[PDB]
Amino acid sequence: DKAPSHVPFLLIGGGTAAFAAARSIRARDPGARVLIVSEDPELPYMRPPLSKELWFSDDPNVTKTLRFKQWNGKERSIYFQPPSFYVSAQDLPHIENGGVAVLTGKKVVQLDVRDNMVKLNDGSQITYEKCLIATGGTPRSLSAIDRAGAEVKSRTTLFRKIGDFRSLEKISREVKSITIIGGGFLGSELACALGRKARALGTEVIQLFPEKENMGKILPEYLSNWTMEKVRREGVKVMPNAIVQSVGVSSGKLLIKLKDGRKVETDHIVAAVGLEPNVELAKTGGLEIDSDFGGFRVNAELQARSNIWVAGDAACFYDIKLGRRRVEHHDHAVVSGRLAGENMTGAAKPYWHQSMFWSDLGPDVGYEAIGLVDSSLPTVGVFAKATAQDNPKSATEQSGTGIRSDYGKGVIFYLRDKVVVGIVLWNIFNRMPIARKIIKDGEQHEDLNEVAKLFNIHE
Numbered sequence: 001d002k003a004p005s006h007v008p009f010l011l012i013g014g015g016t017a018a019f020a021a022a023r024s025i026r027a028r029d030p031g032a033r034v035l036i037v038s039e040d041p042e043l044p045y046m047r048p049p050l051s052k053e054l055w056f057s058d059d060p061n062v063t064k065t066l067r068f069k070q071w072n073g074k075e076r077s078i079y080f081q082p083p084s085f086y087v088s089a090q091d092l093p094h095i096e097n098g099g100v101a102v103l104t105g106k107k108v109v110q111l112d113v114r115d116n117m118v119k120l121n122d123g124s125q126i127t128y129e130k131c132l133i134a135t136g137g138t139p140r141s142l143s144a145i146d147r148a149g150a151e152v153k154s155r156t157t158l159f160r161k162i163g164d165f166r167s168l169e170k171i172s173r174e175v176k177s178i179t180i181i182g183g184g185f186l187g188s189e190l191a192c193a194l195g196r197k198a199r200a201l202g203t204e205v206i207q208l209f210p211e212k213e214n215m216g217k218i219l220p221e222y223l224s225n226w227t228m229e230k231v232r233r234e235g236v237k238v239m240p241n242a243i244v245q246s247v248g249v250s251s252g253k254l255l256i257k258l259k260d261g262r263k264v265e266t267d268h269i270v271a272a273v274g275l276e277p278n279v280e281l282a283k284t285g286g287l288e289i290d291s292d293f294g295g296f297r298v299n300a301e302l303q304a305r306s307n308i309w310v311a312g313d314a315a316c317f318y319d320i321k322l323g324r325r326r327v328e329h330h331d332h333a334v335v336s337g338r339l340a341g342e343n344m345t346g347a348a349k350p351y352w353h354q355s356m357f358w359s360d361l362g363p364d365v366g367y368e369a370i371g372l373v374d375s376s377l378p379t380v381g382v383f384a385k386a387t388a389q390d391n392p393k394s395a396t397e398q399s400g401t402g403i404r405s406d407y408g409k410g411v412i413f414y415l416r417d418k419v420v421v422g423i424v425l426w427n428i429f430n431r432m433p434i435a436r437k438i439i440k441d442g443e444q445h446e447d448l449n450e451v452a453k454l455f456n457i458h459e
């Protein structure tokens with residue numbers, strides 16, 4: 001499949017934000033011709049199942065089909081749409097009533113804002129009328145792993161894509177011990193996924209990270225400590241306060257040495273230590289990068305320049321209510337991609353509907369979050385005993401979708417000038433609209449125990 005020479009809507013990157021933008025454009029303009037250029041070989045797909053439900057299938061073909069069961073058992077594909085949804089890129093200009101094409105395996109390597117043109121890595125030039133940059137980010141490694149040999153680098157997975165799921169799943173069945181580096185939500189999800197597999201196969205899983213507890217940069221100490229206990233109980237050797245000094249190879253094994261002197265021998269490493277936004281195009285493009293948050297600096301409408309917008313993990317945007325931010329969440333990619341698509345068809349709307357975050361550690365434990373969430377902010381948490389329905393599985397049986405979008409549950413309010421600017425919900429489902437309204441209203445609350453009643457948390 002070849003690139004057309006001109007396309008009205010050009011979306012750079014073939015992930016969640018681009019897909020959402022394409023759908024939005026087509027809804028606003030039903031004959032739109034939209035080209036997605038994707039360096040990846042895969043059609044657009046959702047990432048969350050890669051660290052969650054794909055690991056909990058009881059089906060040995062899941063690695064081939066990439067159809068997973070949600071916690072409720074409803075089956076679905078990781079792809080947003082099947083191939084039949086798309087048209088060919090070369091035919092895009094001629095198909096009556098347009099369509100969405102994906103040019104896969106192709107990287108945009110130059111942006112020329114003056115001439116409304118991009119150059120691909122094979123040398124093709126495409127002119128556009130409107131352009132969305134939705135390039136997401138690249139997983140970070142550790143300098144310690146960078147300074148190790150090629151052999152250490154070959155046995156380290158920087159977990160992000162379908163191909164990483166497939167390699168790691170195969171590895172999980174071949175080796176004795178896997179070490180996850182990273183204590184955030186992704187690391188902890190992977191630790192639970194691998195912990196589960198290790199129980200059936202009789203293997204080992206280690207999770208190490210610098211913080212005192214799992215998700216300690218986000219959650220208050222009491223819930224981060226509870227979370228660490230939960231991951232341990234999945235049969236994970238959790239090693240907090242761990243800074244990697246060096247990694248080497250010895251007798252076939254990876255040898256990880258910590259600053260504090262502890263040593264881990266393992267067979268493979270998985271890194272989940274965060275993301276670097278993909279801003280290479282800012283150079284040729286003359287586009288501003290945000291030096292505080294990283295990513296492309298765009299306004300409240302996600303606009304960089306007259307006919308260029310940015311969405312998803314790559315966009316540092318102005319939130320009129322909460323201030324300048326950059327967000328790396330699935331629902332944010334959907335919401336921002338959809339908004340950018342509306343704006344590319346003339347809507348001129350600011351980012352207003354707050355996106356949410358969610359994480360599940362198996363079908364029994366879930367977290368949701370919205371707004372400005374950081375364990376350095378002042379927090380007030382209100383907790384209660386969990387009922388039978390306060391878990392991701394029993395929630396998934398209602399919707400029924402796994403893609404969200406004695407204490408066992410609770411709410412945590414994150415405060416700035418004693419207004420709620422962020423909320424985390426622990427095992428409380430189907431209440432994100434209430435959390436969204438609380439943050440939107442921006443009231444000073446006499447009693448956060450009263451607000452907690454809105455989440456069905458009582459005393």
Ligand SMILES: Cc1cc2nc3c(=O)[nH]c(=O)nc-3n(C[C@H](O)[C@H](O)[C@H](O)COP(=O)(O)OP(=O)(O)OC[C@H]3O[C@@H](n4cnc5c(N)ncnc54)[C@H](O)[C@@H]3O)c2cc1C
Nearest residue numbers: 013014015016017039047048108135136312313328329330
């Ligand atoms: C394993 C995993 C699990 C996750 N789980 C959750 C979760 O449970 N909840 C949640 O809220 N969020 C989750 N996320 C985050 C969520 O998936 C991301 O926020 C979302 O994928 C961001 O979408 P995006 O389109 O901005 O970027 P991406 O999905 O990164 O897509 C960008 C695409 O553009 C391509 N590209 C980059 N540069 C170029 C170029 N120059 N030319 C052409 N193509 C290019 C990239 O290769 C990539 O394929 C998870 C992420 C991962 C990796």
